[PDB]
């Protein structure tokens, strides 16, 4: 998966703990221990770790997707605290980079459902202290994500993130003195910050830390949290389900929207161990009917908003049907299902406005408790499966893949109710049950040519944007000698600032060598020039730069002694 680290470089992390260490250094150590744990995980070969600061672009991004571990180490360690708490701008730049990468890859099936097997699982960790937001205008009390998007095509989604990106916020609350209280907490309390609502919306648990021990607990919690799945909004459809008759009727039941009625949850999408690619067959229906005459498409949400009808119904199964079974994250919803203890029934799941005439649409899947009652799994079938499956049963049990005209017209009415993009997976499903001529090759309900050309031009502009981001990434800060304007040698004067990367050439240039060392350097150049060996040197102190490698020294040297 993709690992991204948005790390604050505001002067707030120039505060120090009781350890004598700054918050910035604590963040760097936490990231180091994180990637050590991620290398302990064998998925480190698939892991990629990129870095974003809070400073203005083009220097906002530090490590691009083409960069390696050595450059990533160098940048993360050589970060310096000079920025401002511009959390909204930094988060916007990071999620803009993620969306640019996604639309460059083009797996975003806009207007064609949402394929669960197309995933780009990215986890972004934002490290802050939880101080107030800073802006050149002033202070800001709310995390206002900026609405002006120079990136084209961001209007196709209402939210800047997608369902495959999970954001987790670390909040540094280490006290100035040593905490006399010993932390007996076995869990991580939630923070109270403006990043917390956006964290919960995108599907993350923002953590606030106070000691290194529970910091390690938070870090290993995130390490266990590194998985691949889909973030889905779950909403209860229809009335409340029937309470279990084995328990007393609770008078004190709250009459309102439950968290298990409406909780945002992830569903794990386990890739095929044989291939390493996640496998799915049926995308979720869209929240609008796919119109072949519409020149524009409605903007879809970041997360698929589905509605589950709590009516217990029999999960019907027909052999050789390609269905998508995925395992859900534990939740109040899954807890309520496993409290109901009904693995033999299932609750239907729908997508609103999936049909032309039906607001709720037709059922496309169900949630079903596992046989061992340890979890709840989502089973995704073709849309309007209670209509399609009896037709398939009649065709392959009576008609023997030779459809009658009444079956053909019933199936065609089902196709008319069926949303246009599903024909492909339906064609593959029918050809793997064994009737490839049941659906002809002539009809293909494609999208409108205006939307297709708009998407192609959007992809071209995304390629241009990715090229210019690739060019922009890796550029260090530019130190200025600009003209300082002041009133009370004609208005264009600048006093030069001191540069650490000056590297004066005392031997080549005479305007170096200050007065104290003048005679000694003079004798030094004279000794150099009147020695005049094969090699002449322009720098007196060329000791080293950063590291001294034994392997590199032995490689530059030769050893003519095999001694076998």
């Amino acid at each position: 998966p993709i690992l991204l680290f948005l790390i604050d470089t505001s002067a707030s992390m120039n505060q120090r703990s009781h350890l004598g260490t700054t918050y910035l250094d604590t963040a760097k150590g936490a990231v180091e221990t994180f990637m050590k744990l991620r290398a302990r995980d064998p998925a480190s070969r698939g892991d990629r770790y990129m870095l974003v600061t809070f400073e203005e672009p083009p220097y906002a991004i530090k490590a691009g997707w083409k960069e390696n571990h050595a450059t990533f180490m160098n940048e993360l360690k050589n970060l310096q605290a000079e920025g401002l708490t511009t959390l909204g701008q930094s988060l916007r730049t990071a999620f803009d980079l993620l969306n640019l990468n996604r639309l460059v890859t083009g797996i975003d099936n806009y207007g064609q459902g949402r394929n669960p097997f197309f995933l780009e699982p990215a986890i972004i960790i934002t490290i802050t202290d939880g101080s107030k937001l800073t802006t050149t205008s002033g202070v800001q009390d709310e995390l206002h994500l900026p609405l002006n998007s120079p990136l084209p095509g961001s209007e196709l989604t209402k939210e800047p993130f997608r369902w495959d990106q999970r954001l987790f916020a670390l909040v540094l609350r280490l006290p100035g003195t040593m905490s006399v209280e010993s932390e007996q907490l076995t869990g991580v309390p939630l923070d109270d910050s403006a990043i917390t609502p956006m964290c919960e919306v995108t599907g993350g648990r923002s953590y606030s830390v106070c000691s290194p021990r529970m910091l390690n607990q938070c870090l290993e919690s995130l390490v266990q949290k590194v998985q691949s799945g889909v973030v889905i909004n779950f909403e209860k459809a229809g009335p409340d389900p029937s309470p279990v008759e084995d328990g007393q009727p609770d008078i004190s039941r709250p009459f309102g929207s439950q968290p298990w009625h409406s909780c945002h949850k992830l569903i794990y999408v386990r890739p095929n161990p044989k291939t390493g690619v996640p496998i799915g067959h049926w995308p979720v229906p869209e929240s609008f009917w796919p119109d072949q005459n519409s020149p524009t498409l409605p903007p879809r949400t970041s997360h698929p908003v589905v509605k589950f009808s709590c009516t217990d119904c029999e999960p019907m199964v027909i052999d050789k049907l390609p269905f998508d079974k995925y395992e859900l994250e534990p939740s109040p919803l899954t807890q309520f299902i496993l409290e109901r203890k009904s693995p033999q029934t299932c609750w239907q799941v729908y997508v609103s406005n999936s049909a032309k005439y039906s607001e709720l649409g037709h059922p496309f899947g169900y949630l079903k408790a596992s046989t061992a009652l340890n979890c709840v799994n989502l089973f995704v079938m073709p849309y309007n499966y209670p209509v399609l499956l009896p037709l398939l049963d009649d065709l392959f049990k009576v008609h023997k893949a030779k459809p009658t005209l009444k079956w053909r017209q019933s199936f065609e009415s089902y196709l008319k109710t069926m949303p246009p993009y599903y024909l492909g997976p339906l064609k593959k499903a029918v050809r793997m049950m064994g009737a490839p001529n049941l659906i002809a090759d002539s009809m293909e309900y494609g999208l409108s040519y205006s939307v297709i050309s708009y998407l192609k031009k959007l992809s071209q502009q995304a390629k241009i944007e990715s090229d210019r981001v690739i060019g922009s990434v890796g550029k260090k800060v530019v130190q200025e000698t600009g003209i300082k304007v002041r009133s009370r040698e004609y208005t264009g004067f600048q006093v030069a600032l001191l540069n650490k990367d000056l590297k004066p050439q005392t031997f080549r240039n005479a305007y170096d060598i200050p007065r104290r060392n003048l005679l000694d350097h003079l004798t030094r150049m004279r000794s150099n020039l009147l020695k005049s060996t094969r090699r002449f040197l322009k720098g007196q102190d060329e000791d080293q730069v950063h590291s001294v490698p034994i392997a590199q020294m032995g490689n530059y040297q030769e050893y003519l002694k095999q001694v076998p």
């Binding site: 000698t481 000056l502 004066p504 050439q505 305007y511």
Partner: peptide, 8 residues
Amino acid sequence: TSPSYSPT
């Protein structure tokens, strides 16, 4: 041929 300080 050096007429001033090198960085500036």
